[PDB]
Amino acid sequence: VGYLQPRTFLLKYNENGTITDAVDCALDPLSETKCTLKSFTVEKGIYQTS
Amino acid sequence: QFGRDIADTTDAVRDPQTLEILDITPCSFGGVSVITPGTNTSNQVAVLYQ
Amino acid sequence: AIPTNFTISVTTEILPVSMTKTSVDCTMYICGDSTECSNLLLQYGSFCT
Numbered sequence: 720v721g722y723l724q725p726r727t728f729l730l731k732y733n734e735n736g737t738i739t740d741a742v743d744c745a746l747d748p749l750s751e752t753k754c755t756l757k758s759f760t761v762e763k764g765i766y767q768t769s
Numbered sequence: 770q771f772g773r774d775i776a777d778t779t780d781a782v783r784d785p786q787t788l789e790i791l792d793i794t795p796c797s798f799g800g801v802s803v804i805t806p807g808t809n810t811s812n813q814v815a816v817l818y819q
Numbered sequence: 820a821i822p823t824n825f826t827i828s829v830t831t832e833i834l835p836v837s838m839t840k841t842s843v844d845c846t847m848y849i850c851g852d853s854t855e856c857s858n859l860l861l862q863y864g865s866f867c868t
């Protein structure tokens with residue numbers, strides 16, 4: 720059993736229309752930069768988060 | 770009854786029970802940055818609190 | 820007309836090279852700590868980015 724909270728997620732749709740991956744945008748600062756860049760890949764560097 | 774600053778937001782208030790003046794401060798403050806070597810290389814990150 | 824003596828002169832020149840670096844938290848400026856305003860502002864995220 721687990722409990723739901725209001726969150727913002729970044730969901731990924733493949734070319735067939737199925738959700739294959741997701742990012743929880745408020746888990747980590749890393750996840751926050753993923754959410755901002757709107758990508759699952761981050762290049763080397765320093766990013767302002769929030 | 771209320772005190773307002775330059776941005777016109779309320780920053781002081783008289784308590785209606787004890788008649789004492791109280792200051793109001795926001796509780797979100799301070800800049801954050803994240804350092805990553807690239808998601809391709811690793812998931813380890815560093816965080817800078819400015 | 821030919822000069823017969825000289826003068827050695829030192830003068831100064833001033834140049835700007837850089838300015839202050841700034842960053843903005845868009846939600847902090849627009850909404851403060853209001854959750855409802857943030858839910859409304861989620862429609863304009865591209866502009867803050």
Ligand SMILES: *[C@@H]1O[C@H](CO)[C@@H](O[C@@H]2O[C@H](CO)[C@@H](O)[C@H](O)[C@H]2NC(C)=O)[C@H](O)[C@H]1NC(C)=O
Pocket residue numbers: 824825826
């Ligand atoms: C060339 O110019 C210099 C100054 O620019 C002269 O030197 C000065 O000479 C006077 C008297 O002749 C002195 O009272 C000053 O103290 C000197 N100044 C320095 C810095 O030494 C020099 O005499 C000039 N030479 C000629 C041939 O005119």
Ligand SMILES: *[C@@H]1O[C@H](CO)[C@@H](O)[C@H](O)[C@H]1NC(C)=O
Pocket residue numbers: 733734735
């Ligand atoms: C998408 O659909 C095609 C055709 O049915 C299938 O071959 C493929 O495995 C499906 N998945 C992906 C990720 O393409």
Ligand SMILES: *[C@@H]1O[C@H](CO)[C@@H](O)[C@H](O)[C@H]1NC(C)=O
Pocket residue numbers: 785786787788
């Ligand atoms: C109201 O109640 C508070 C606490 O019960 C008391 O200190 C105060 O004297 C009361 N009267 C006024 C006018 O605040």
